[PDB]
Amino acid sequence: GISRDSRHKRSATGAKRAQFRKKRKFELGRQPANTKIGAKRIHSVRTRGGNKKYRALRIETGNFSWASEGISKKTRIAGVVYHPSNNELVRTNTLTKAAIVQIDATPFRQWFEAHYGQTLKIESSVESQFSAGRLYACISSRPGQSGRCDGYILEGEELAFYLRRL
Amino acid sequence: KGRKLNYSVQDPIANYEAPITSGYKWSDDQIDEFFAG
Amino acid sequence: SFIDAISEKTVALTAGRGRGKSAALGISIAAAVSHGYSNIFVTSPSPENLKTLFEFIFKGFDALGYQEHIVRVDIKQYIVPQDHQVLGQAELVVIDEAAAIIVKNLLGPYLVFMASTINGLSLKLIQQLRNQEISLDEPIRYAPGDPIEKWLNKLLCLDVTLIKNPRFATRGTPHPSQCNLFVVNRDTLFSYHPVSENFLEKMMALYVSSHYKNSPNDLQLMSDAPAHKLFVLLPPIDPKDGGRIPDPLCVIQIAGEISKESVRNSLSRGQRAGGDLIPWLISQQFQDEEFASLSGARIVRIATNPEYASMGYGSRAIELLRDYFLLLKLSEQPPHYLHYLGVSYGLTQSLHKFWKNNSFVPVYLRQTANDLTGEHTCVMLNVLEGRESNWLVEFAKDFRKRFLSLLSYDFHKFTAVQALSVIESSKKAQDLSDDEKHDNKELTRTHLDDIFSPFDLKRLDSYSNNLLDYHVIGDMIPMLALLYFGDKMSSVQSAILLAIGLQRKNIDTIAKELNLPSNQTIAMFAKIMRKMSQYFRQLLSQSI
Amino acid sequence: FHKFTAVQALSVIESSKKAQDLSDDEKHDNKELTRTHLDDIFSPFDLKRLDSYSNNLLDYHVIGDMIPMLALLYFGDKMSSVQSAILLAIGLQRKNIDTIAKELNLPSNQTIAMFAKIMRKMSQYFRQLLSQSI
Amino acid sequence: VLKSTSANDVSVYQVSGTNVLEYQNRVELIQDFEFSEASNKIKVSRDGQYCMATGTYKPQIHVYDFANLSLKFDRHTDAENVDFTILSWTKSVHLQNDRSIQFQNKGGLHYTTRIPKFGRSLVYNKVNCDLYVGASGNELYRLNLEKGRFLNPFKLDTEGVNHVSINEVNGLLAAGTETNVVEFWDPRSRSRVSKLYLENNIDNRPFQVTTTSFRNDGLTFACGTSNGYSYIYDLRTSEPSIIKDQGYGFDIKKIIWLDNVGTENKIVTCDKRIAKIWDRLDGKAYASMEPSVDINDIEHVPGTGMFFTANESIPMHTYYIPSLGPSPRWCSFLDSIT
Amino acid sequence: MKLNISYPVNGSQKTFEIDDEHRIRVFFDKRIGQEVDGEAVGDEFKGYVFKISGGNDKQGFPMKQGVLLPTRIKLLLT
Secondary structure, eight states: OOOOOGGGSOOTTOOOOOOOOOOOTTSOOOOOOOOOSSSOOEEEEEETTTEEEEEESSOOOEEEEETTTTEEEEEOOOOBOOOTTOTTHHHHTOOOTTOEEEEEOHHHHHHHHHHSSSOOOOOHHHHHHHHHSEEEEEEOSOTTTTOOOEEEEOOTHHHHHHHTTO | OOSTTOOOOOSTTTBSSOOOSSOSSSOHHHHHTTSOO | OHHHHHHSOOOOEEEEEOSSSSOSSSHHHHTTHHHHHHTOSEEOOOOSSSSTTTTHHHHHHHHHHTOOOOOOOOOOOEEOOOOHHHHHHSOOOSEEEEEOOOOHHHHTTTTTSEEEEEEOOOHHHHHHHTOOOEEEOOOOSSSSOOHHHHHHHHHHTOSOOOOOOOOSTTTSSSSTTSOOOEEEOOTTTTOSOSHHHHHHHHHHHHHSTTOSSOOSSSSSSSTTOSSOOEEEOOOOOOSSSOOOOSOOOEEEEEOOOTTHHHHHHHTTOOSOSSTTTHHHHHSOOSHHHHSOEEEEEEOOOOSSOHHHHHHHHHHHHHHHHHHTOOOOOOSSSHHHHOOOSSOOEEEEOSOHHHHHHHHHSOOEEOOOOSSOOSSOSSOOEEEEOOSSOOOHHHHHHHHHHHHHHHHHOSSSSSSOOHHHHHHHHHHHHHHHHSSSSOOSOOOOOOHHHHHHSSOHHHHHHHHHHHHSOOOTTTSOSSTTHHHHHHHHOOOOOTTHHHHHHHHHTTOOHHHHHTTSSOHHHHHHHHHHHHHHHHHHHHHHHHHO | OOSOOOOSHHHHHHHHHHHHHHHHHOSSTTOOOOOOHHHHHHSSOHHHHHHHHHHHHSOOOHHHHSSSHHHHHHHHHHOOOOOHHHHHHHHHHHHTOOHHHHHHHTTOSOHHHHHHHHHHHHHHHHHHHHHHHO | OOOBOOOSSOOOEEESOSOOOTTTTOOOOSSSOOOSSOOOOEEEOSSSSOEEEOOSSSOOOOEEETTTTEEOOOOOOSSOEEEEEEOOOOOEEEEESSSEEEEEOSSSOOEEEEOSSOEEEEEOOSSSOEEEEEEBSSEEEEEESBTTOBOOOEEOOSSBOSEEEOOSSSOOBEEEOSSSBOOEEETTTTEEEEOOBOOOSSOOSOOOOOOEEOOTTSSOEEEOOSSSEEEEEOSTTOSOOEEEEOSSOSOBOOOEEOTTSSSOSEEEEEBSSOEEEEETTTOOEEEEOOOSSOEEEEEEOTTSSEEEEEESSSSOOEEEOTTTOOOOGGGTTHHHHO | OEEEEEETTTTEEEEEEOOOTTTGGGSTTOOTTOOOBSTTTOSSSOSOBOOOOOOOOTTOOOOOSSOSOSSOOOOOOO
16 A cells, blocks of 8 residues: 555645655555455554554455354355455455355354254245355455454345345 | 546656567568468 | 678678579679788688689789789788688688588688678578578679570579469468378479479479579489379368469389399399388398388478478378379379388488477488588488388387497497487387387396496496495496496486486586586486486396 | 597507406406307397308498497407407407598508408407307 | 475475475575465566566565575565566566556666556567556557557457467467457457357356467467366367366466477466476376465476476475476586485 | 584584595585595595584685575575
């Protein structure tokens, strides 16, 4: 990154003759670490005293949350199909916040068969993924700042809310 | 489409390199009789 | 004008490229007298003969108006003509020329002498136009010319003409994708007419492109041979009503000689047929000496087309495989009229690309020569293969004999090529390893033969100089015989194998290291090869 | 073969000095046995000996006088006598130079006659080896 | 003596592997060869030294001098890179994951320009000097280094292109698209010449061609896919091909020739985990180079038998083959240690 | 050359100025850690084995264990 200041750009009035200043330390834009899938490597960068910041690049073990009961359990990552904060970001298959990524939902199968007995009330277009294995789930946590991959599962309303999109 | 495809002329790259006369070691007749088909 | 330019610049680069006459050795050699009087003293040509008589005007001008009195000139201003190698390896000079000449040596002399290279349509013109410059190819010293010479050149094809152009979509290379070329067996193909003899002259141009020098029997004694046939590429086209020849190769045949070769050896003409001369006098053969010969005279390919240049050797091998499967362009007459018994071979003139073509040919080479010639760097090693595969024992015996001769020929040429040596050993291995199987087993570690060839002190010396710190001079007494023994009887990639061949040819470690890698790298590769050889001999002495 | 291409007479003097040291020092200890039959059959070829006979009754050209000349010079300097011209021929095949170099430098007289004498010594060696083994 | 992996009767070695008494017999070739936990793309310059390796987090340039066996600098560039070339020595051009293009010099960062859409590949033309940059969509752009203009961008098919390359001895512009068509343009005419289609026999899903290559004879063309299937092509009966399924087959990214050293008609293929090498005209594997981690791409040093990968681990692996060729003049005791 | 030699368990070390470089030439092109014999550096010390442990050259510059390239090169150290 470069900057965080209004001095390089124009305001709501249209001004000119900028030529302002050598940029300070507190306009610090670090490089955009597009977090991907790999082996888990988090860079421990420093800022503002001992404010360590976890910059995750190759995180896997996503803690994704069963919605209707709120069961955040551990799984892997496959790939993001739709994220128009950059439509090339899904072409390159990175992993950022608020992305809709696919999960092999085998521990969710284990929890359902463990606290319900039988195997398969829950919606049908996610029951198809209960059968097959890959369910859609959206990342909540920030791997570029907190270094973690947490998320929430897609269950019904939010599922169709994304499936009608793409 | 503001910063998208500015068809301007830029200062440091206007003489960043220099061309070559013969270039391809083949002939252009070799191009024509190379991919006639 | 070139005399003034080379007298005022020594810089000056002229090439006198003849076609058939009238400018090859005279005018650009007479263009040196102003330099030899006013600006030079170190003149040094390199011709065989008839160069001072070619520059007789320069010689007479120097003898009558530039020097107060053949051999090198003087002042009371040397002109030391030499060989091509001495011209390349010794020229701190101001003027140098070699008419009718063998061009990398003359390129090796371009340091301070004025560039005047001349010859009487070869790769020297390509090397002169691909360097980085004047070209002499002009009319004769006569008003209109000679109509007698015009009639003789019409009847003899002294001049060539490129005629190929992109006059259709199917002209350049839309056809050159799966073109299977035909034959031409018209025994009176050079009968006087406009169109057929025009196409014959165009085939003569495509045959004499990238050929040998301007011979006297180029299109005058090979035009009236017994069965001098040719091929014509670009077969697959039906958009028009024509045809051209991109592969005009020359083959010939002669006697089949089961009594004739023995009768000729009785009549003191044992080198009668080119097939049964070197094979018949190599090891006194029986079946390959009893067979007749069908060889090649001048191969041809595309000096014009890229795809046909790639496919020319494939088309030549396909014409050989089709042979071993009025004016009528036909390939169906030799479907029954393409018959032989064992006459299927050739002989390829010794170039590295030519031996690569012989390896793609895979018809294999026996042996080139012992020495060099005044018109050839090395003689054409005889290639051989057939489709009706029956001469497996003859091929394997000839390959083992030629490989033993080559791997023993240490100081045969004494300035040979390591790449050509690798190609020769590769053709030997391919010929002995693909007939049916090599029915001559290698040396399977006969420990009596091991203790017979190398003794105990040579064994311990090789083992110590491998497993410890010693010298190449400390263990290079066995560096000649162990190379041939390893090549005849492990693994060595093409760097280590070339190093072993260089040691067998007794070149110095620094002398090959200054060429290929480096001294330290070559010594490490030699140390690894000696470790491998000591490992195999230690396995032999451990098993027996 | 590699880095000793000095002389003929001095090379013969060095070989004679080494053999003289061996004869003066040894009683019967380092007494080598002669060229064995099957080993001598393996060292040459049968067609190589056919070319040797072709040199015996015909010309001695390089199609049969270069592939076998290394084993010829090795067995000649191993072990039943040689002349001065024949000794220079054995040393010339050991130094592996061509015909018109070594003999024309050393003797400087009767080049083709000395080449024919070398061919005759080669024919005598080939006849001795053939009539010994085969 | 460095250990060697098992192969088909042939030996390879790695230097700077994940495993590479050992501390006191260290075999380190290039000092400070390690990045910040991954690697983007490595390539070796045309002359005999100065290899360049792009960065991973706070991405750098990392020029290594081969005649000093260590690092020269690391210009921390502004964004994360995907593709670049080197233009001889000191100049080089890069493009990042965003649609921006950097021009590094001896002083570094001579300019930063942009392209209107997100780019994926860049090549330079030695003849008349226009870099062609392949991006997403209908758009294959030019930035000519003569007069710094823009040129009339090449109209493609729908989705775009994964790789662009021009032929060396004659200039035939390749562009590996998504819909199996290879879209050969002519660098002379600025128009199409052919739209060759790629076929198979398995047809899992509609693969996209990701790697294009040529060599210095100017007659063949090496083609890739998004499935782990190498392809050869000629003008001679250009509709079929020879194919090479690979035993894992995710996405082949680097297919490069051996057209300037000995042991000829050989080619290196490289997908995400493995990089193999086979022979032309049969399609049989000469060797393979299986590492302990995935591969971002590779490169092969000219004149000799060594390979440099960019991977997803902390160091980069170098792979030496003592049968393909020797080790070069600056590594001229690798043949003495192993 | 001068040869520093160290017998570590007894705690002894001494330098020996050995001229006559064909004695020295046993060590040549052998990097650090690879062993050596006494037989080709000397005769009066036979059955001897020395693990080399570096050495300052003339101009005093040290060698660090195991890089490459027996000339001088410019690296980045502590």
